[PDB]
Amino acid sequence: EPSPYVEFDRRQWRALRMSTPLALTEEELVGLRGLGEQIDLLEVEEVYLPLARLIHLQVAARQRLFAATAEFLGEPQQNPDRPVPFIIGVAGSVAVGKSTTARVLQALLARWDHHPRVDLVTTDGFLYPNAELQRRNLMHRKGFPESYNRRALMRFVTSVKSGSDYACAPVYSHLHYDIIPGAEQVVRHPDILILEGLNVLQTGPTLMVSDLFDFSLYVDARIEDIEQWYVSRFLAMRTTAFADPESHFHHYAAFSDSQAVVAAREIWRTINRPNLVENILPTRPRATLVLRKDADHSINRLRLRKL
């Protein structure tokens, strides 16, 4: 029976790469790869290149849609070379790899003919300050929809896509586990804006950023695996981030593999997992493209929305 989707195995997907050129060194893929991630240039070749090709085919097509409305509205023509920014959403669970997926994607798309301004904005900075979360009894729901200033987030994307000269987003510090005072990321009329976060794909009683997306990615994996990835990465961070005396979680550095595992699982059980199940996963159905990962972080399956 008919389906809005079309699935592929990596062999199948690899072939749609067609002629697409690989413009990234292995030293560059590294500065994009997050701790624990297994992405290599091969995967970028058989998976991210076709995806970049697809996206570019749609970037031009997606604008005929706006032009039409512009033609209808009698309005003049586009603004000869400052089009409606193509907005891309990247969603997925904590520790699934989306952050890397988002960075690799921005790199590939920026290295394109004529060289388009491709900005990447994570929703981290749209989290409420710890003081504000403390006030709303939310310090233990960081990552849940309500922990974000979803209104500010919407004003931001709406602004950039509505053709603004520049827009600002706050900045979150992963070292201090909090929003950075006075800091800001400025975005100037990009050609493509990539928005990455746990729920970007959420719908609601109001127009949300998921409604402004022209294309969307959802990095997926078996829930047991992600937990394994989360915990492993947690243990792994004892000698990297947590090692730093400035880290809000420096006390974790001294944990034993054993107590660190216990600590990691508890956080996952009480926070990240509930949010994945209750909020993130239910948005997967409408992702333009879903990247399914095997326990080894390898992307070997894909589901595309043809409808």
Angle between the 223-236 and 257-267 helix axes, to the nearest 10 degrees?
A: 130
247 is in an annotated binding site: no
97 is in an annotated binding site: yes
Residue 241 to residues 101, 121, 250, 285: CA-CA distances in angstroms? 21, 22, 8, 34
Closest Cα to residue 302, out of 2, 15, 1?
15
Residue 71 to residues 6, 74, 85: CA-CA distances in angstroms? 33, 5, 18
Q: Does 37 bind ligand ATP (CB under 6 A)?
A: yes
Q: What is the DSSP letter of 123?
A: G
Q: What are phi and psi of 200, to 5 degrees?
A: -5, -35
Identity of the residue, 93 or 210, whose beta carbon is nearer to ligand ATP in the bound complex = 93
Overall residue count recorded for the chain in this entry:
307
Stretch that binds Na ion, among 81-89, 94-102, 114-122, 224-232 (CB under 5 A): 114-122
159 is in an annotated binding site: no
Q: Does 135 bind its own copies (CB under 8 A)?
A: no
Q: Does 34 bind ligand ATP (CB under 6 A)?
A: yes
Q: Does 94 bind ligand ATP (CB under 6 A)?
A: yes
SS3 of 6, please? strand
The 16-45 site mask, x for binding its own copies (CB under 8 A), equals: x-x---------------------------
Work out what residue 121 binds among ligand ATP, Na ion, its own copies, none; the CB cut-off runs from 5 to 8 Å by kind: none
Q: What is the dihedral of CA 306, 155, 106, 185, to 10 degrees?
A: -170
**The one among 30, 35, 60, 131 contacting its own copies by CB under 8 A:** 60
95 is in an annotated binding site: yes
Stretch that binds ligand ATP, among 11-19, 22-30, 97-105, 286-294 (CB under 6 A): 97-105
d(CA 88, CA 196) in angstroms, rounded, equals 8
**The one among 82, 135, 188, 222 contacting Na ion by CB under 5 A:** 188
CB of 99 to ligand ATP, least distance (A): 3
Environment class of residue 300 by beta-carbon count within 10 Å: exposed (0-12), middle (13-18) or buried (19+)?
middle
CB of 287 to ligand ATP, least distance (A): 16
**The one among 11, 72, 182, 186 contacting its own copies by CB under 8 A:** 72
Closest Cα to residue 201, out of 51, 98, 273, 125?
98
Q: Does 11 bind its own copies (CB under 8 A)?
A: no
Q: Where do we find the tokens 């624990």?
A: 36
- Which stretches of the chain bind Na ion, using CB under 5 A? 119, 187-188
- Which stretches of the chain bind its own copies, using CB under 8 A? 1-4, 6, 15-16, 18, 50, 53-54, 57-58, 60-62, 64-65, 67-69, 71-74, 84, 155, 158-159, 161-164, 203-207, 211-212, 282, 285-286, 304, 306-307
